[PDB]
Structures are given as structure tokens and as C-alpha cells.
């Protein structure tokens, strides 16, 4: 006898293929959804086993009903904690960071503040990979800084590695690199 183990939330995995030729929204595809521990690992292990990372090919895991874009009702007033990797952290750090990020989400690692979490995004870029946790209200200093503190600790980043929280509204009018931060941790 084998019972499945429900997650607190249902999650959706999205794929994105970079192409500045086409409008941004056109490059997004919903892969599948899951709401159990078993189904999470089945999907995670399948991607690790049968797929290869590719520059310009992003994955996003968001709560059911939240599209992984600024436009979404649940993201428009929100923002993200951004982790920027060096080019050499691609190997033997990116995979660890991403899985640890996924587990923060589905395990609701931020306690009552996990409610403010929308999802997470990994960008694979030759310029340097990026991982981010998106939250729903960029002005909720309490929730945002708590999520940031726990997230940084969970990833084991050295204290002198300062990570920043960007409002999506600011990002939309500049760039994730030149976008100034609302908070640091």
C-alpha cells in the first residue's frame, strides 16, 4: 500500500525560450502541474535525466493560477529576490541552488510568509545564470525581508554576498542588472 503525500499548494512548471524577435509573452509554455511530493520528484528527476540546460531556456515554478510574468494580478505589485551566479557557478552550484529554491517553495519554508510567495524563476544565460523568488507585494517590508533572510541562509551564500530585492515595476522600466533595489539582505 502506497499513499501519495499532498503539498500545501498546487504548482505549475513553465518553460520559456528566449527570442527578442517575438513578443515576450509568446515565448512562455505551461509544462505541467503537480500537488504531491511524489509528482514533484517525478517531474524534477525526469528533467534532470532526459533534458539538457540551454542558454535562453528558463524554467519557472509558480503557484497554480499565477502566470510567471509581471502582468499577473499577483505579480504586478510585487518583486523578486535575485541571485546572480558567476559563469563558473553554472557547474556544481546552479543545480544545487535551483533544487534548494524549489524545495523552499513546495515545502513552504517561509512559514506564514510563504503566502506572499508567487514562484521562482531560473534564467540560463551565457552572461551568468540567475535564480529568483518572486513575491506578491514589494512594499511588505516584513514579509519580503523575512523571505530574503531565510532564502539566503537556505542557499548557504557567504554573508558578504549581498542579494537584492527588485520591484517588478522598477524592472519593467529598466533592466534586472541596472534596476536598483528596494531591499538588500
Ligand X SMILES: C[n+]1cn([C@@H]2O[C@H](COP(=O)(O)OP(=O)(O)OP(=O)(O)O)[C@@H](O)[C@H]2O)c2nc(N)[nH]c(=O)c21
Residues making up the annotated binding site are: 24-25, 70-71, 125-130, 173-175
Q: Report which of 56, 58, 31, 30 is spatially closest to residue 43, judged by C-alpha positions.
A: 31
All three cell numbers of 109, joined, read 519554508
Site track 14-53 with ligand X (rule: CB under 6 A), x = hit:
----------xx----------------------------
Q: How near is the Cβ of 25 to ligand X at its closest, in Å?
A: 6
Using CB under 6 A as the binding rule, whether residue 184 contacts ligand 33R is answered as no
Neighbours of 57 (CB within 10 A): 17
- Scanning 1-9, 69-77, 140-148, 158-166 for contacts with ligand X by CB under 6 A, the matching segment is 69-77
User: Residue written as cell 524563476?
Assistant: 121
Alpha-carbon span 39 to 111, nearest angstrom? 22
Q: Are 122 and 59 in contact (CB under 8 A)?
A: yes
Residues 158-177 that bind ligand X (CB under 6 A): 175-177
Using CB under 6 A as the binding rule, whether residue 175 contacts ligand 33R is answered as no
Out of 40, 59, 70, 134, the only residue in the binding site for ligand X (CB under 6 A) is: 70
Q: Which of residues 53-82 bind ligand 33R (CB under 6 A)?
A: 57
Strands 57-63, 6-17: pairing is: antiparallel
Residues 28 and 14: beta-carbon distance below 8 Å: yes
Q: Which residues are annotated as a binding site for mRNA?
A: 24-25, 70-71, 125-130, 173-175
Amino acid at each position: 500500500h502506497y499513499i501519495k503525500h499532498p503539498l500545501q499548494n498546487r504548482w505549475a512548471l513553465w518553460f520559456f525560450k528566449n527570442d527578442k524577435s517575438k513578443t515576450w509573452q509568446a515565448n512562455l509554455r505551461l509544462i505541467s502541474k503537480f500537488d504531491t511530493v511524489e509528482d514533484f520528484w517525478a517531474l524534477y528527476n525526469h528533467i534532470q535525466l532526459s533534458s539538457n540546460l540551454m542558454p535562453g531556456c528558463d524554467y519557472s515554478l509558480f503557484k497554480d493560477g499565477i502566470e510567471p510574468m509581471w502582468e499577473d494580478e499577483k505579480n504586478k505589485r510585487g518583486g523578486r529576490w535575485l541571485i546572480t551566479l558567476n559563469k563558473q557557478q553554472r557547474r556544481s552550484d546552479l543545480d544545487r541552488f535551483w533544487l534548494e529554491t524549489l524545495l523552499c517553495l513546495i515545502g513552504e519554508s517561509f512559514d506564514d510568509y510563504s503566502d506572499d510567495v508567487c514562484g521562482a524563476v531560473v534564467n540560463v544565460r551565457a552572461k551568468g545564470d540567475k535564480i529568483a523568488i518572486w513575491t506578491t507585494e514589494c512594499e511588505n517590508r516584513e514579509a519580503v525581508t523575512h523571505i530574503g533572510r531565510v532564502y539566503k541562509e537556505r542557499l548557504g551564500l557567504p554573508p558578504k554576498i549581498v542579494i537584492g530585492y527588485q520591484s517588478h515595476a522598477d524592472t519593467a522600466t529598466k533592466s534586472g542588472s541596472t534596476t536598483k533595489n528596494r531591499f538588500v539582505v
